[PDB]
Write a protein that binds this ligand. Structure first.
Ligand SMILES: [Cl-]
Ligand SMILES: [Cl-]
Ligand SMILES: [K+]
Ligand SMILES: [Mg+2]
Ligand SMILES: [Mg+2]
Ligand SMILES: [Mg+2]
Ligand SMILES: [Mg+2]
Ligand SMILES: [Mg+2]
Ligand SMILES: [Mg+2]
Ligand SMILES: [Mg+2]
Ligand SMILES: [Mg+2]
Ligand SMILES: [Mg+2]
Ligand SMILES: [Mg+2]
Ligand code: NA
Ligand code: NA
Ligand code: NA
Ligand code: NA
Ligand code: NA
Ligand code: NA
Ligand code: NA
Ligand code: NA
Ligand code: NA
Ligand code: NA
Ligand code: NA
Ligand code: NA
Ligand SMILES: [Sr+2]
Ligand SMILES: [Sr+2]
Ligand SMILES: [Sr+2]
Ligand SMILES: [Sr+2]
Ligand SMILES: [Sr+2]
Ligand SMILES: [Sr+2]
Ligand SMILES: [Sr+2]
Ligand SMILES: [Sr+2]
Lengths: 46, 56, 194, 65, 81
RNA sequence: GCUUUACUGCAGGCUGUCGCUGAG
RNA sequence: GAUACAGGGUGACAACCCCGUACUGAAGACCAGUACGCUGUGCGGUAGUGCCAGAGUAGCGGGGGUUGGAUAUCCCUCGCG
RNA sequence: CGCACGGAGGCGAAGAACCACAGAUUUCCGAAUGAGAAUCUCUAACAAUUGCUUCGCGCAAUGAGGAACCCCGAGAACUGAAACAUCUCAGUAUCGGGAGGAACAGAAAACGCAACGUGAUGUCGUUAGUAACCGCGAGUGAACGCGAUACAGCCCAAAC
């Protein structure tokens, strides 16, 4: 499949949203990424 | 051929995509119409009274 | 003495007699070859136009609208319906041809507001009505002590809400007493029984 | 912090346009040191550089360039 | 309004292009053309750009590979900034 | 759901009449 | 203490520890570009005069819908007027 | 120096934080309006429909949204009738069009406790399950008046 520029920006964003909650937020809140999406297990849009 | 599992293999067509207007994955790229907000069909937004209970 | 206007009025009392009979036979031939909504410079019935509110001023538009003759153009039921609700042929609409005309006119002119309308005849298959429309944005009207009322925000799209004289007459609002129990103040307030 | 509102209004339209390009270059060169993952940084200055550019642009609108 | 050059792209592959091919890599704005990237680099750094190669990265940004002339040295330009 | 000379109706077709529609 | 014993907070049951609470006062919004006031215009009465006063209307008939509307609801449609 | 109690660093007596009002900025798609397009792209744009008009997009209008309420149109069936067709459910559900901060109505070709009487219109209480309708079955169902609320009355066409 051939992706467009906008489709690429969205996929790019979804990949960034897939990073873990930083180590410092755990210490600041004194103690979970609920939007964890896998390439196989989960499904994106379009 | 079974209508079940062996007919699922042919399913690689892309139809419903992210809509420019509402953001929902309902823009039918072959019909150029959105099944959620009515983009491509109407200037007005697709809303219906049956989307909620009669007295609500 | 009699006005010149009173002669146009007296002629239209019998549109099938006299000079008007020949005038209609001629004019309708040109009208049948015209559109659905045709803007005209001057009203065919000056007396009636002036009587209804027309002034030879800026922002006062007149247009002739032709709507089809007869009952409802209805589709037959594609689902289960009891004998009573199985009709197609004898069903007529609750809005008169004059109102369908006024609406078609106001849609052709999305900036103007309907003041009134009047009949200008019919042949065997269609009816003609001329509609007086007003520009609420033109200062020639915003300063007119006789027509400035139509510039108010609440007069926006007045024909579609039945605020026209043809609207109010069709809504059964003519009588102030007996027979108007289910019509006044609105049909909707009386549970749609008018 | 180093650049105040009164000091930008004392400046002439050409001095602001000159100070804008000076701050944009100090910002680009701060972002460059951040791109390399450098240690001799100052996290509070890169924050102020953006606010200062906003202030000069707000004064440019207020004065009519 | 948007600025053309966002920040320099400094990675291992970016250094190889700088040391051996005299190429400076930049993360630019995705609405910028090859010509607009060339001009902005010649203005912000005082160099002569020969060729620009653009790629729309999987980061939502646009990466531009800018080759300088023989008169200019990419290693010397990246060291001052 | 389906059938028909089941009950009752509804489209549709045919036909008269009125309007469009006029001169001798 | 109290014109303040409403409520909350505070390491356990608090009028008097803290915010508040009564009392007094301030501002904004709505009422409302309204009321009142003003400016201007000019109300009215007698006699004479068949000068003027909204048509497919009032109304009648065929067919329908609607209504409690029954002969006596309201509306649409075709014809006539 | 948000949620958010980290680290580094920073800002604040040049009165920061914070709050109120006002203003600046305000990407792209979106009624979406130069043209096209799954939020991007291609070569000056009120696209389209209108009014005015210097007849030039010059000046303007419309479009779409909003919890429900409001107004104008289209309009079921399950159900009840212990079946069912008129009737009922119901002018309900749902659909089309449209306005406002409220809508609609409204100064009598009224009423008709018939009078030597009332006096624009909504709404509330009542009149009343009364009159009226109805396989006169099941069911359906007003009004005048009265007591209240609030009150407000005017402009054309024509005559000259
Ligand atoms: Cl209108
Ligand atoms: Cl009375
Ligand atoms: K039924
Ligand atoms: Mg990754
Ligand atoms: Mg049934
Ligand atoms: Mg009401
Ligand atoms: Mg490329
Ligand atoms: Mg009925
Ligand atoms: Mg476009
Ligand atoms: Mg039953
Ligand atoms: Mg029975
Ligand atoms: Mg009923
Ligand atoms: Mg009565
Ligand atoms: Na997947
Ligand atoms: Na209109
Ligand atoms: Na970056
Ligand atoms: Na069956
Ligand atoms: Na009739
Ligand atoms: Na009725
Ligand atoms: Na904003
Ligand atoms: Na416009
Ligand atoms: Na123009
Ligand atoms: Na039963
Ligand atoms: Na049965
Ligand atoms: Na019945
Ligand atoms: Sr899978
Ligand atoms: Sr296939
Ligand atoms: Sr379409
Ligand atoms: Sr809708
Ligand atoms: Sr409008
Ligand atoms: Sr990456
Ligand atoms: Sr009269
Ligand atoms: Sr009164």
């Amino acid at each position: 499949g051939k992706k467009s520029k906008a489709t690429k920006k969205r996929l790019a964003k979804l990949d960034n949203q897939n990073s873990r909650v930083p180590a410092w937020v755990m210490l600041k809140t004194d103690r979970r990424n609920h939007k964890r999406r896998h390439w196989r297990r989960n499904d994106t849009d379009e | 051929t079974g209508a079940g599992t062996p007919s699922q293999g042919k399913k690689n067509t892309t139809t419903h995509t992210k809509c420019r207007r509402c953001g929902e994955k309902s823009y039918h790229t072959k019909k150029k119409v959105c099944s959620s907000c009515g983009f491509g069909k109407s200037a007005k937004r697709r809303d219906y009274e049956w989307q909620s209970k009669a007295g609500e | 003495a009699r006005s010149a206007y009173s002669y146009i009025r007296d002629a239209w009392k019998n549109p099938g007699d006299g000079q008007l009979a020949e005038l209609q036979w001629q004019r309708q031939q040109e009208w049948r070859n015209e559109g659905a909504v045709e803007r005209i410079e001057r009203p065919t019935r000056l007396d009636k136009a002036r009587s209804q509110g027309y002034k030879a001023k800026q922002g006062v538009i007149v247009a002739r609208v032709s709507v089809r003759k007869g009952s409802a153009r209805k589709r037959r039921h594609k689902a289960g319906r009891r004998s009573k609700r199985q009709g197609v042929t004898r069903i007529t609409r609750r809005k008169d041809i004059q109102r369908v005309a006024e609406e078609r006119a106001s849609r052709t002119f999305p900036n103007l507001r309907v003041l009134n309308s009047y009949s200008v005849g019919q042949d065997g298959r269609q009816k003609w009505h001329e509609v007086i429309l007003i520009d609420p944005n033109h200062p020639a009207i915003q300063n007119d002590d006789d027509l400035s009322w139509i510039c108010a925000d609440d007069q926006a799209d007045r024909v579609f809400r039945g605020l026209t004289g043809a609207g109010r007459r069709n809504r059964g609002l003519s009588g102030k007493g007996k027979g108007s129990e289910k019509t006044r103040p609105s049909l909707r307030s009386n549970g749609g029984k008018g | 912090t180093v650049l105040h509102v009164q000091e930008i209004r004392d400046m002439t339209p050409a001095e602001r346009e000159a100070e804008l390009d000076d701050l944009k270059t100090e910002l680009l060169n701060a972002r460059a040191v951040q791109a390399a993952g450098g240690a001799p940084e100052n996290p509070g200055r890169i924050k102020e550089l953006r606010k200062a550019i906003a202030r000069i642009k707000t004064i440019q609108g207020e004065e009519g360039d | 309004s948007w600025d053309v050059i966002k920040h320099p792209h400094v990675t291992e592959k970016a250094m190889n292009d700088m040391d051996f091919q005299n190429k400076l890599q930049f993360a630019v704005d995705d609405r910028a053309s090859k010509g607009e990237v060339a001009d902005a680099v010649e203005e912000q750094y005082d160099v002569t750009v020969e060729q620009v190669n653009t790629q729309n990265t999987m980061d939502g940004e646009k990466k531009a590979v800018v080759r300088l002339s023989e008169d200019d040295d990419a290693q010397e330009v990246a060291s001052r900034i």
